[PDB]
Amino acid sequence: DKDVLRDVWFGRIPTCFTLYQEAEPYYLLLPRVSYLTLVTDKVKKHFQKVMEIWFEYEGTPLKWHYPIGLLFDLLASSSALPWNITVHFKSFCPSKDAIEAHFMSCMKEADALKHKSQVINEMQKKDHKQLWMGLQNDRFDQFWAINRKLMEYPAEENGFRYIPFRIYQTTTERPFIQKLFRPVAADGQLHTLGDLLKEVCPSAIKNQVMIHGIEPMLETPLQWLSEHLSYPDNFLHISIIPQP
């Protein structure tokens, strides 16, 4: 269990950054759980034997506010490695404060979904800063020290109130799908990934259902997935990709 958490957290994607139509390509291992603008300072640095930088994969712009692992999963995982990303220049990248604010809005949405009483809002600005720093400085211990409490639910309940997930289909150019979904069925048994898809997105059941670069069995309990295969934003970002 704890090993799954770490394995998710430390996931890397090998990436080749090539300048759009002399600059050598630039290679980097990207953290799956982070955001491009955070980890690509050195890529921007490097592509400056030139006289506002943005990224694109095979025609699609890569958006600042998605996790890197999701973008790869959805857009490039069908292709061979390294991820081939094209670097582009503007003549005139959100702030770290802007990213932190997006991140925290996401955590807050996830919190309001999971708990009857908002745990995140009972925390101190100290703890929120540690959540962000934990993500930004790639420190699993510091982040999970706080994130632990966000993953608690009262023992009598068998799971969160609602599971925070977002389902992506084919391209980030289509909006992701969300709706209230409980981890436990009326009969009392645990809902599966299969149950979630069957409800929220019946056409995924030909298709690949990818979470953090792997394909869980559909029979996998959703509550556990939520606790273990969420991104740090506390969401399950799920890709539905055409085979193969």
Partner: protein, 40 residues
């Protein structure tokens, strides 16, 4: 461990084997070289 958890763990180790471990040293080496080329 139930079959599905075994599955997730296996697939995450395999994933790391293919993606992170394969590329770490060669990307580091390439960057050493890149930095050595920037000295002209």
């Amino acid at each position: 461990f139930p079959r599905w958890k075994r599955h997730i763990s296996e697939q995450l180790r395999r994933r790391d084997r293919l993606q992170r471990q394969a590329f770490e040293e060669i990307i580091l080496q390439y960057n050493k070289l890149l930095e050595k080329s920037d000295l002209h």
